[PDB]
Design a protein around this ligand. Structure first.
Ligand SMILES: *[C@H]1[C@@H]([N+](=O)[O-])C(=O)NC(=O)N1[C@H]1C[C@H](O)[C@@H](COP(=O)(O)O)O1
Ligand SMILES: O=c1[nH]c(=O)n([C@H]2C[C@H](O)[C@@H](COP(=O)(O)O)O2)cc1[N+](=O)[O-]
Lengths: 264, 264
């Protein structure tokens, strides 16, 4: 998208050479923000073809509070295969913290539910937050949350959301994350009878892996196409009752996809 | 400061009228980011006189893991009086989460120390994070963290930091928060033998209280002055051994202060 490609170009021009956890090496910048008015269309890249099936199921997976890949397998999504153990468990990652943040006094807090309640009863609240960064359980996670913290905001009947992503693989992960949260905002907005507002993306360590250079330059030479449209065929009783069939994307005509190795 | 004043003006131009928790009413925007190259000087507002004594003592207080105002009273700082109970307790706020985030299995994590360890042994890590947003204890806090999440970054021997502030009182709180974190970066950098890099500030609900409008336009009509300089007179054994006396600010010639009512 225009914002996406400019960020990608920015990492190449200003990025600094860093040695990472994987030993692959990256080019990175620290601190960046981009806004997406969801009224203009669904922020799904067009300079690269994205598998919408994987994005929708992972989000529905998160909302269930599931941390076992069994569910993703039944739907043919193998994006979390590398980090899962023999049983398909990942530890108390994303979903677990969203749906059941464990407190020291034995209780469990459902952040998504409180957020829905805040949106409906106290939309002006400045504390409408969901955090996946549970310091007490990071050690038990197969991987620390990349998209770790997000906040909702309501103004003029429009629902906005800002995401703080501490670590970001610009080529492989970013376009997946943007679509994922944009989708959530739509689901939230529908359940709370609000209009969609802006999706603000804020990143920490924003990088481009050294073995993605060629693919990046390839994508950078492509002209972005008009943004698609997200259609939701029905309104479920709750935000936990959505299904894959409920979502329809229209006007999505992307350039052919680009293959690239994943850094584990 | 140029960045500060432009932000202020932006809230006036693009802000939307919102009703808040205090019933005061605010003008607010959602999502904003500004950078401060700490090499250019210490980011302490000049178009308004700021009380450096309060900023430093609160920070030292945070670093001790203290949540009782007794310490602040002993040094004549009354910035937290309105929220403290009869005993001067505020609940597990900032300092408690920083020095002793309680895990569900009876342990306690010192986030400041682990960060120091990461900067010395693994500066290229993308998980150098401190979070005050402990979902499980928000209900026990006198007030939910405004400056809730921050991340460090190292590149070219320079230490940078990005802060995510979910709620921001632009007139009363922002200049205080900028100076506080900028001071932390210098302390961190000095302990780890690194140079100071950038301080990136990112905000969620960034606002201006309706009863702060006149004061705002008054300040906005002022010409910012050259940034002051921070001088640290010594290098303590640990980041927990600093004292008010170790800090010296030079070349600070601000405009006269502007009084304004605090929204509780
Ligand atoms: C809160 C604050 N704090 O110490 O508590 C700080 O450091 N900076 C702020 O600007 N800040 C403000 C934001 C908001 O106007 C209120 C807190 O209220 P809620 O956002 O309603 O929780 O204080
Ligand atoms: O959704 C995501 N977004 C994303 O870009 N990341 C990337 C960032 C980075 O390249 C890597 C995780 O590594 P580290 O930052 O070393 O923990 O994976 C990883 C996730 N993720 O695992 O869910």
């Amino acid at each position: 998208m225009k914002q996406y490609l400019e960020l990608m170009q920015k990492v190449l021009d200003e990025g600094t050479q860093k040695n990472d956890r994987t030993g692959t090496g990256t080019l990175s910048i620290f601190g960046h923000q981009m806004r997406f008015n969801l009224q203009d269309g669904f922020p799904l890249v067009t300079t690269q073809r994205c598998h919408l099936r994987s994005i929708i199921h992972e989000l529905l997976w998160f909302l269930q509070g599931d941390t076992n890949i069994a569910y993703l397998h039944e739907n043919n999504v193998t994006i979390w295969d590398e980090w899962a153990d023999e049983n398909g468990d990942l530890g108390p990652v994303y979903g677990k913290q969203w749906r059941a943040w464990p407190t020291p006094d034995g209780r469990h807090i459902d952040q998504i539910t409180t957020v829905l309640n805040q949106l409906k009863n106290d939309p002006d609240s400045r504390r409408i937050i969901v955090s996946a960064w549970n310091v007490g359980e990071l050690d038990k996670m197969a991987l620390a949350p990349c998209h770790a913290f997000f906040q909702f905001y309501v103004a003029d009947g429009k629902l906005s959301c800002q995401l703080y992503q501490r670590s970001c693989d610009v080529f492989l992960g970013l376009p997946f994350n943007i679509a994922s949260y944009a989708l959530l905002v739509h689901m939230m907005a529908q359940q709370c009878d609000l209009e969609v507002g802006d999706f603000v993306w804020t990143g920490g360590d924003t990088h481009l892996y050294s073995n993605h250079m060629d693919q990046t330059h390839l994508q950078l030479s492509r002209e972005p196409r008009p943004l698609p449209k997200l259609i939701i065929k029905r309104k479920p009783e709750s935000i936990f009752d959505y299904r894959f069939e409920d979502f329809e994307i229209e006007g999505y005509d992307p350039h052919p996809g680009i293959k690239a190795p994943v850094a584990i």
